[PDB]
Amino acid sequence: LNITGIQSDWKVEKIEFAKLTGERARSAGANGRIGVHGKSCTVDIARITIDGQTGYGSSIHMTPEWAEDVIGRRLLDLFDDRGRLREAYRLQLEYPVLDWLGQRQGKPVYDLVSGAHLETGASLVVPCYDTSLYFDDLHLADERAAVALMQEEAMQGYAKGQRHFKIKVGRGGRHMPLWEGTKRDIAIVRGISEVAGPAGKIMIDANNAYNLNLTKEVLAALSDVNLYWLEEAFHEDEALYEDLKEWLGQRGQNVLIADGEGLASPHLIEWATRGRVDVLQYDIIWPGFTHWMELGEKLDAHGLRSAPHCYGNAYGIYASGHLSAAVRNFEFVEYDDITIEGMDVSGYRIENGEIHVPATPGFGIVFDDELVTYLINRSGWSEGHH
Ligand SMILES: [Mg+2]
Ligand SMILES: [Mg+2]
Numbered sequence: 141l142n143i144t145g146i147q148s149d150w151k152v153e154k155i156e157f158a159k160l161t162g163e164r165a166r167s168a169g170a171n172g173r174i175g176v177h178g179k180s181c182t183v184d185i186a187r188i189t190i191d192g193q194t195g196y197g198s199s200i201h202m203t204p205e206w207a208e209d210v211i212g213r214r215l216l217d218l219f220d221d222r223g224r225l226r227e228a229y230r231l232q233l234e235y236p237v238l239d240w241l242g243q244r245q246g247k248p249v250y251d252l253v254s255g256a257h258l259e260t261g262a263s264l265v266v267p268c269y270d271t272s273l274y275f276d277d278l279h280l281a282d283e284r285a286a287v288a289l290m291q292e293e294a295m296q297g298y299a300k301g302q303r304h305f306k307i308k309v310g311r312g313g314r315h316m317p318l319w320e321g322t323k324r325d326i327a328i329v330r331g332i333s334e335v336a337g338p339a340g341k342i343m344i345d346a347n348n349a350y351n352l353n354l355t356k357e358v359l360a361a362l363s364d365v366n367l368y369w370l371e372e373a374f375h376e377d378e379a380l381y382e383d384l385k386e387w388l389g390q391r392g393q394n395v396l397i398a399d400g401e402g403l404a405s406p407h408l409i410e411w412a413t414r415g416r417v418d419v420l421q422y423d424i425i426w427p428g429f430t431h432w433m434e435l436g437e438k439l440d441a442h443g444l445r446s447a448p449h450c451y452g453n454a455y456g457i458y459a460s461g462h463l464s465a466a467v468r469n470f471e472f473v474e475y476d477d478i479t480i481e482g483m484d485v486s487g488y489r490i491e492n493g494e495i496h497v498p499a500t501p502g503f504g505i506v507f508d509d510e511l512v513t514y515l516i517n518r519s520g521w522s523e524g525h526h
Contacts, residue, residue: 141223141253143216145245147191150215154189155207155233157199158512158520162454162480166296170275172310172347172372177274181478183455187512188236189526190215193244196507197235198425198455204521206232211524225430234430235459235503242502249503250465253433264497266464268473268490269304269343270297271451273332278315283324287331294335300477303493305336306343306371309358313349322354326361333365340493341368343398348372352380356387359395369396369419376405381416401449413442419471424448424456429463436467447471454478458485458505461497482508482515 160183168177186199210233218229218237225234242249250264273293277286294305307329312321325344333342344367350358355373374380376399388395398419400408411417420439424432436446446467450456457475464470473495484506487498498504516522 141219141225141241143219143223146216146219146241148214148216150191152188152190152210152213152215152218152524153192154187154522154524154526155202155210155236156187156189156512156516156520156522157185157202157204157207158187158515159184160480160482160512160515162478162483164272165477165479166272166276166293168272168274168276170278170315171308171345172313172349174347181452181454181480183453183480183483185455185483185507185512186233186236187507187516188233188240189524190237190240191244193240194509195236195238195240195243195502196505196512197237197239197503198453198459199233199236200231200425202232204523207523224434230428230430231426234428235455238429239502239505246501248497248499248501249462250497253462254465256465263499264461264465265494266461266473266497267304267471267493268302268475268495269306269341269493270294270302271306271474271476272297273305273307275308275311275315277324277328278311283327286324287327290328291331291335294332297477298335301490301492301494302475303336303339304341304343304368304472305332306345306474307332308347309344310346310349312354313346322358326358329362329367330365342366343369343371345371346373348375350374352383355384359388359393360391363391363393367395369398371398371419371421372401373397376400376408376411376417378407378411378414378416381411385416396445398447409438412439412444417444419445419447421447421449424450424460424463425453429459432463433466436463436470440468443469445469445471447474450474451476454480454483454485455505457495458488458497458503461488461495462503482511484508 167179309325312318396418400421
């Protein structure tokens with residue numbers, strides 16, 4: 141981030157907070173470890189005002205008491221001598237602040253953070269995948285029926301421009317009997333592979349419901365299906381992933397190991413640098429965008445891949461698209477089709493397995509000021525003044 145244009149008199153004038161609500165296009169069922177996710181979605185949003193101009197973005201871990209202590213601070217003082225937002229402000233304010241900087245400079249965040257030296261202008265187009273393939277089949281006793289239902293769901297995404305798909309597996313860990321559930325996982329993946337076709341990338345996500353041998357059984361069953369990655373087969377463990385990697389190598393089966401969401405092992409990155417994990421999946425909100433810019437740099441330096449987790453928060457989708465400009469080995473935007481009341485994302489569009497990020501200021505999302513003001517006053521909160 142270049143902050144040489146930030147004037148020292150620009151101060152945080154107001155911070156306001158509200159929870160926006162919406163719905164995903166199709167209700168999401170269970171996954172390997174927990175129950176139905178549902179259709180309702182929310183996004184916690186803050187609106188910051190600095191030098192008479194507003195910026196909007198995701199905000200977490202912020203209380204009115206915390207914000208009260210930030211009012212009156214100079215924007216410059218929120219940054220490192222290296223142009224990086226200080227740790228203390230990231231979760232609460234990085235998104236509103238980055239949006240703000242984009243509004244004030246009239247640039248999309250991707251241009252602010254890319255560190256690019258070549259002339260800008262080229263449209264930002266980023267691979268994405270459909271993450272919405274949950275255990276939506278559990279009400280069906282028949283395996284073939286289950287496959288057909290999941291194929292239809294994949295087709296729904298395909299019609300909306302999705303070409304790559306992540307399929308939840310691990311049905312036998314908790315929700316179905318172990319052996320039947322595992323057979324069904326395999327059959328569903330095969331079925332979706334037929335939908336996606338030869339250029340469609342297929343990922344599977346067990347949400348830790350497998351163990352090493354169950355994982356080997358599933359992978360062997362799916363030899364003829366080109367799987368792009370295997371995500372959270374079981375809780376990350378250097379010894380188990382070392383084994384799996386060697387096993388995959390012996391079979392010449394090319395499947396990336398992906399991990400890192402939730403409460404990750406504190407040694408996961410170490411394990412990745414030693415070759416046990418290929419794709420890292422820390423969440424786009426926590427630890428966040430600034431963190432990911434630094435992490436992405438380190439991962440790039442080791443030839444490791446970045447695939448920020450995003451689920452449960454629609455805002456993170458658009459953030460992920462912008463982050464891609466700052467990380468060489470950026471894999472995909474994890475996409476969930478969500479409509480949030482008051483959050484106009486129409487500048488973005490999906491086409492042929494890619495999300496086209498608009499070149500408009502900040503994150504290119506236009507919030508409904510009046511609705512947000514209502515929500516702030518009704519249930520949210522406000523600190524500072526105009
Ligand atoms: Mg996952
Ligand atoms: Mg994990």
